[PDB]
Write a protein that binds this DNA or RNA. Sequence first.
DNA 1: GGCGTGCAGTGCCTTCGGCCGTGCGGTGCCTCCGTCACGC
Length: 199
Amino acid sequence: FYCSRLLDLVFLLDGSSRLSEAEFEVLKAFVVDMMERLRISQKWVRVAVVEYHDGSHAYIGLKDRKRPSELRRIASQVKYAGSQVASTSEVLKYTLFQIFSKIDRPEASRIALLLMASQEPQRMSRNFVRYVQGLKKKKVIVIPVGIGPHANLKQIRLIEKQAPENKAFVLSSVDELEQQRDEIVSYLCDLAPEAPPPT
DNA sequence: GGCGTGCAGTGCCTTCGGCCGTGCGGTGCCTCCGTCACGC
């Protein structure tokens, strides 16, 4: 449908080589479709787009004052990485420290849509749960989205085990996205308040 | 000549030096299998 609520949504795209050139474009299209079903505004739904590999490469910020159509273009032109490493620990650390360093919008919900499709090196996962728990303390909901046979199930279930609102969406392939979009959007929307503060 | 340790972290508390602890790279399910450098 169309989400018109106070929400800060953060898209986190796995940049590993697990996803092919094409398969990644599909993921991007999914993110674009999501955005078409969101009321993009500083006072309603704010969006952020981040392709992550060894590190986080942000294309869109929550405070970016741009026309939604423009943002959709940007989100569709996200460059393919195809890295050997897509650190979820790093992208969650980035989200926690860079994106949500300061909670400037209490009146809205904070959601991190973690689109993963691989397994990061175990040594990198050392402080993983600490970032997830750290996001929780800033009241940021993390929704893992498993894509493909290589998506780290252990971490995904570990995210759910961290917070009540943290639900996972285990998928079979990037094709399962389009036919799961509507369900996901509505789920995220129902986590955000509908009406602003009295002001 | 075996051991036992190694150390991340916008770290933490009992503050300017202990205490916890994935030495580390890389495979592919995981919190790990198999491996190297030092000092003694």
